[PDB]
């Protein structure tokens, strides 16, 4: 549901609530919250 | 073992008794009695979903400790995961013990993956008769297609033709 | 060699053949008590050599008191065959060399007839007059081997460093704590060995076991519950409901907690 990505195989992953939080792909435990969509305003100052 | 079920951390009679020296017999007595303490409880107070914690095969929380007694990789432990759950559609191997279906699914996997492991050595290692062990890999020949997990096929890093025949 | 001494009973001549004075006719061998360095002391001292052979060869050259010690070709080649005995006392007093062996124990004024003495056949055996030290000739062809050993000494580390596990984690972490394997080991075992034992009692009739009793009163007057139940092989209950007839339990005397006979059948 929401979007991850592991530590240092830099996978991308979908997360449920009920699913455990670790890479499918590599195994490792740690992962990153990917990144927001919506537009960031910043000033240039 | 109650504790370790209900944090999904479940071990094995096997386990507790390697801990504690405890007959089998009232060990399972006790278990029985304490489930059902609890289970009062919980309908006294508070109620608690039980959502798979409780069950006795639990096959798939045996897998990863296995794997790693034996120091198989990830995508060997992924992939005994997966055989192990679709051993639970096997209507023939279903009866069987939870720690004879994780480790025959292991050998299977091993099997597959070409890991340098005896069969012998996986019974030393995870207590379980080679006998055993050997049966039910000669019992899931038959159905090599359902349990090896497809795109592991379709990627290539295994092949069906690398399993020993019967 | 366990002895008492302070003995006026005179038993030594008869618990000791070899007299316990100390032997003394030897104490005029002159010793020169020699100081060696390890290498000469371990093919010296150790006691799978020193068949009696010859080890070398004593030079003294009086023109300054010099003695020199030649060994022979027969030990080693790497170590020196020539050594200077340097005397670091020419003139040594109250040094005495003496013997210790085992005897022949087969076939104010107030005093006290015990002293825990231990004799022993002692022998003054030499008398040590020179005081000498070995040392390496500075111009052999082993010397700078010599050399090379004794920086050796302080080169070499006799302990090794600790082994390191090169074997995945997992593989070593299988042994330990929940594990499927059982304990094979068979060490303190106690608990296996005690109940593998079990004591089955049939009921014999109540003349047989009562007989039974009186013979085994008669054989010995006090009893205890244990001995007395290894020796009838039957129950608790029964046994009791036979004792408290025909028996009492002593509760304040010096043989409390037994079963003893009554006073009437005392007597029988
Ligand atoms: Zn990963």
Redesign the pocket.
């Given at each position: 549901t929401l979007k991850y990505i592991?530590?240092?195989?830099?996978?991308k992953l979908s997360l449920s609530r009920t699913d455990a939080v670790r890479?499918?792909?590599?195994?490792?435990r740690i992962?990153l919250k990917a990144r927001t969509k919506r537009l960031v305003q910043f000033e240039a100052r | 073992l109650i504790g370790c079920r209900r944090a999904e951390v479940a071990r094995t009679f096997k386990e507790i008794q390697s801990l504690i020296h405890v007959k089998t017999k009232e060990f399972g007595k006790t278990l029985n009695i304490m489930k059902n303490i609890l289970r009062g409880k919980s309908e006294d107070g508070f109620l608690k979903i039980d959502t798979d914690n409780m069950s006795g095969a639990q096959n798939l929380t045996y897998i990863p400790r296995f794997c790693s007694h034996l120091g198989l990789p990830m995508q060997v432990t992924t992939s005994a995961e997966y055989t192990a759950k679709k051993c639970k559609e096997i209507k023939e191997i279903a009866g069987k013990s939870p720690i004879t279906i994780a480790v025959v699914s292991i050998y299977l996997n091993i099997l597959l993956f070409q890991i340098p492991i005896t069969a012998a050595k996986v019974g030393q290692t995870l207590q379980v008769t080679e006998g055993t062990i050997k049966s039910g890999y000669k019992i899931l020949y038959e159905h090599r297609d359902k349990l090896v997990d497809p795109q592991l096929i379709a990627n290539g890093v295994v092949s069906l033709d690398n399993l020993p025949g019967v | 060699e366990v002895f008492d001494g302070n003995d006026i009973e005179n038993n030594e001549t008869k618990v000791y053949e070899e007299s316990l004075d100390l032997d003394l006719e030897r104490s005029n061998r002159q010793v020169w008590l020699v100081r060696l360095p390890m290498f000469l002391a371990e093919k010296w001292r150790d006691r799978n050599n020193l068949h009696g052979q010859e080890l070398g060869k004593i030079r003294i050259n009086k023109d300054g008191s010099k003695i020199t010690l030649l060994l022979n070709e027969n030990d080693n080649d790497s170590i020196p065959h020539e050594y200077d005995l340097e005397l670091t006392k020419k003139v040594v007093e109250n040094e005495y060399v003496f013997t210790e062996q085992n005897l022949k124990k087969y076939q104010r004024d107030r005093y006290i007839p015990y002293v825990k003495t231990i004799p022993k056949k002692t022998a003054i055996v030499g008398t040590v007059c020179h005081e000498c030290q070995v040392m390496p000739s500075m111009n052999d062809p082993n010397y700078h081997k010599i050399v090379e050993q004794r920086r050796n000494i302080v080169k070499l580390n006799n302990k090794e460093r600790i082994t390191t596990l090169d074997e995945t984690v997992g593989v070593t972490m299988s042994h330990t704590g929940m594990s499927m394997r059982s304990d094979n080991s068979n060490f303190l075992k106690v608990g296996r060995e005690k109940a593998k034992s079990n004591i089955k009692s049939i009921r014999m009739p109540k003349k047989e076991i009562l007989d039974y009793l009186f013979k085994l009163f008669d054989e010995y007057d006090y009893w205890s519950l244990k001995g007395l139940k290894e020796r009838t092989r039957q129950p608790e209950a029964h046994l009791k409901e036979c004792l408290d007839k025909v028996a009492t339990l002593v509760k304040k005397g010096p043989y409390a907690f037994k079963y003893t006979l009554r006073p009437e059948y005392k007597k029988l």
């Open positions: 592991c530590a240092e195989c830099s996978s890479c499918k792909d590599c195994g490792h992962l | - | -």
